[PDB]
């Protein structure tokens, strides 16, 4: 039997650990270990998003998961959507606990521009927020932009290839969230020594109506990757629409970073 | 077309609206309206259980859902497990808004004993809490008993006929909660004029390892229902293990209260 791996899964903004409920047992029946992190004010975390003012506070459960790993363990760290920024933050802290970063339908930041750069780009270009509700909360350090998806938007742009049961599930669980774009605009650049040094791949879904092909190309062109995988027929919420194929991509990724 | 109904669905302690994620579209595909209430300190409600000190504050989202229905609208009110208690409290307030109460693997309280009666009875005989963590929280109402299920208990006792994905999902979402037995011990008995006047059916699952069959017969014996339905092979989380069959049973109920 080939050596198995520890996958750490990081969800998107407005969601929580729960998105991983299909993928987790698939990975584990193959003998892998899975930790599905729950980020601050996400999922059933007890804080509201208003109380989590910075992307570091938001990402803190991921940092604590990596910190607590036994000495010399390395993981496959998968970041979904805004989870991309989370995993880059973490790779800048704990580069040698990460064997490979998996950017899954994700923001892939660079080491050249401010940390918000790919988000601000997508914000200028995205059109069709639908019933999403935007607002902001003033903190002692600046305005914080918040968002709560609307359900029409959800159906059309994130979940359009998911089983209806999954759409319904998400409507009972999604929460108000943030992309922390003001905080990220003020933060020091991601480093070449930390984040830049870690191996990285990109997994894209062919029918992602959030993160389009052009925008990925663009991000990859700013900050190259080892390898790109495509999941055929997946919507943004590929771990729900096509968990089997997402499994297949993550097993391929495990095989390229084979242990010993 | 047969007249369709509005089902209001009330989840169990330590869980939330999310448990209904399979049953809701089944009901909606058949043309019905569904409201899955998210009770206080449950699911993604932003309150911790420690901030919800009485069963009345726990139940408030249900009462507010019934209160905001248009006039003369009646619902099929379905209460799962401790959700029985919630729905009984709701019936004693808005009896005329409920066509029928559906006790689903539920606690069925009576109008003669203290509201906690059926829970105190199960609690005495129940054993094997497994890895469940019990704790105490002191309030201005006296001590409150809290519980958080442990994952081995959940697998064996709630989720054993569920798909593994459902079990994993629950592990990600279940929360510390309470059966409010102290508050329910002290509360005024449910009334004949409110709760007791409302039509009620019972729906039981044949492989429920929380609520034994004998316990159910004892409850119905203290307090009759119009009719009893059974879901063959269901564990306690019958909405997850046998959603289709639950749908079948709820259609049958709806057909009768046309
Ligand atoms: N309410 C209820 C039951 O589903 C239950 C809740 C927590 C633990 C065991 C049983
Ligand atoms: O996960 C993607 C996303 C997109 C828009 C709003 C919130 C989350
Ligand atoms: O669609 C996701 C997103 C994130 C940041 C800005 C705009 C869009
Ligand atoms: O009171 C005992 C008990 C047991 C399981 C669920 C709810 C109550
Ligand atoms: C998008 N998170």
B123 Cα: distance to centroid of ligand 4 (angstroms)? 6
Q: Does B177 touch chain A (CB under 8 A)?
A: no
The number of distinct structural domains making up chain A is: 1
Q: Which of B11, B158, B27, B14 is nearest to A165 (CA)?
A: B27
Q: DSSP state, A49?
A: G
Q: How many CB pairs under 8 A join A and B?
A: 54
Assigned token pair, A99? 């064997």
Other C-beta atoms closer than 10 Å to the C-beta of B121 total 16
**What is the domain extent for residue A164?**
1-260
Cβ-Cβ contacts under 8 Å, B165 against chain A? 21-22, 25
Other C-beta atoms closer than 10 Å to the C-beta of A134 total 9
Q: What angle do CA A80, A215, A237 make, to 5 degrees?
A: 30
Q: What angle do CA A185, A191, A193 make, to 5 degrees?
A: 175
CATH of the domain at B131: 3.40.50.1820
Closest ligand relative to A79 C-alpha: 5
- What number of helices (H) and strands (E) belong to chain A? 10, 8
CB contact under 8 A, B175 and A38: no
CB contact under 8 A, B169 and A21: yes
Give me the residue from B16, B22, B168 closest to A165, CB to CB.
Answer: B22
Active-site residue, B81 included:
yes
User: For residues A238 and A78, what is the distance between their CA atoms, to the nearest angstrom?
Assistant: 13
Residues 5-34 of B with CB under 8 A from A: 16-18, 20-22, 24-25
Closest ligand relative to A122 C-alpha: 3
- Measure A143 CA to nearest chain B CA, in Å: 22
- Measure B53 CA to nearest chain A CA, in Å: 17
**How was it solved?**
X-ray
Assigned token pair, A40? 């601050």
User: For residues A73 and A96, what is the distance between their CA atoms, to the nearest angstrom?
Assistant: 9
> What backbone torsions phi and psi does residue B168 show, to the nearest 5 degrees?
-65, -40
| C-beta B210 within 6 A of ligand 4 | yes
User: For residues A50 and A48, what is the distance between their CA atoms, to the nearest angstrom?
Assistant: 5
Q: What angle do CA A151, A156, A162 make, to 5 degrees?
A: 90
A148 Cα: distance to centroid of ligand 2 (angstroms)? 9
User: For residues A165 and A157, what is the distance between their CA atoms, to the nearest angstrom?
Assistant: 16
A48 in Cβ contact with A39 (< 8 Å): no
User: For residues B195 and B27, what is the distance between their CA atoms, to the nearest angstrom?
Assistant: 26
Q: What angle do CA B11, A23, A174 make, to 5 degrees?
A: 45
Q: Does A51 touch chain B (CB under 8 A)?
A: no
User: For residues B63 and B92, what is the distance between their CA atoms, to the nearest angstrom?
Assistant: 10
CB contact under 8 A, A48 and B43: no
Ranges of H-type helices in chain B: 23-29, 55-67, 83-91, 117-125, 151-157, 164-173, 181-186, 213-222, 238-241, 243-256
Q: What is the largest CA-CA distance in chain B?
A: 54
Please name the residue that has the structure tokens 């002191």.
B138
Expressed in Å, this structure's resolution amounts to 2.0
User: For residues B197 and B192, what is the distance between their CA atoms, to the nearest angstrom?
Assistant: 6
User: For residues A37 and A24, what is the distance between their CA atoms, to the nearest angstrom?
Assistant: 12
Buried b (16+ CB within 10 A) or exposed e, B32-41: bebbbbbbbb
Q: Whose CA is nearest to atom 5 of ligand 4?
A: B210
B233 Cα: distance to centroid of ligand 1 (angstroms)? 19
Other C-beta atoms closer than 10 Å to the C-beta of A179 total 24
Q: Which of A88, A90, A33, A81 is nearest to A61 (CA)?
A: A90
Using CA atoms of B246, B248, B253, B255 in order, give the dihedral in degrees to the nearest 10: 160
Buried b (16+ CB within 10 A) or exposed e, A202-228: bbbbeebbbbeeebbeebeebbebeee
Ligand 3 pocket: which of A122, A145, A159, A180 to mutate (most atoms <8 Å of CB)?
A122
> What backbone torsions phi and psi does residue A147 show, to the nearest 5 degrees?
-150, 150
Q: Which of A42, A89, A101 is nearest to A64 (CA)?
A: A89
């Amino acid at each position: 039997m080939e050596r198995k791996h520890h996958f750490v899964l990081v969800h998107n903004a407005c969601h929580g650990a729960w998105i991983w409920y299909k993928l987790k047992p698939l990975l584990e029946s193959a003998g892998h270990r899975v930790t599905a992190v729950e980020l601050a004010a996400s999922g059933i975390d007890p804080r509201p998003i208003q109380a989590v003012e910075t992307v570091d506070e938001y990402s803190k459960p991921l940092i604590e998961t990596l910190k607590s790993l036994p000495e010399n363990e390395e993981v496959i760290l998968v970041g979904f959507s805004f989870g991309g920024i989370n995993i880059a933050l973490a790779a800048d802290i704990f580069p040698a606990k990460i064997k490979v970063l998996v950017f899954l339908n994700a923001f892939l930041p660079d080491t050249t521009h401010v940390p918000s750069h790919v988000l601000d780009k997508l914000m200028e270009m995205f059109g069709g927020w639908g019933d999403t509700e935007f607002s902001s909360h003033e903190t002692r350090n600046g305005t914080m932009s918040l968002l709560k998806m609307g359900p029409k938007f959800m159906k059309a742009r994130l979940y359009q290839n998911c089983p209806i049961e999954d759409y319904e599930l998400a409507k009972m669980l999604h929460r108000q969230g943030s992309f922390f774009t003001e905080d990220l605009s003020k933060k020091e650049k991601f480093s070449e020594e930390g984040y830049g040094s870690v191996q990285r791949v990109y997994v894209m879904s062919s029918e992602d109506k959030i993160i389009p092909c052009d925008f990925i190309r663009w991000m990859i062109d700013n900050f190259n990757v080892s390898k790109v995988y495509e999941i055929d027929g997946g919507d943004h919420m590929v771990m729900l629409s096509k968990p089997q194929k997402l499994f297949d991509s993550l097993s391929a990724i495990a095989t390229d970073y084979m242990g010993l």
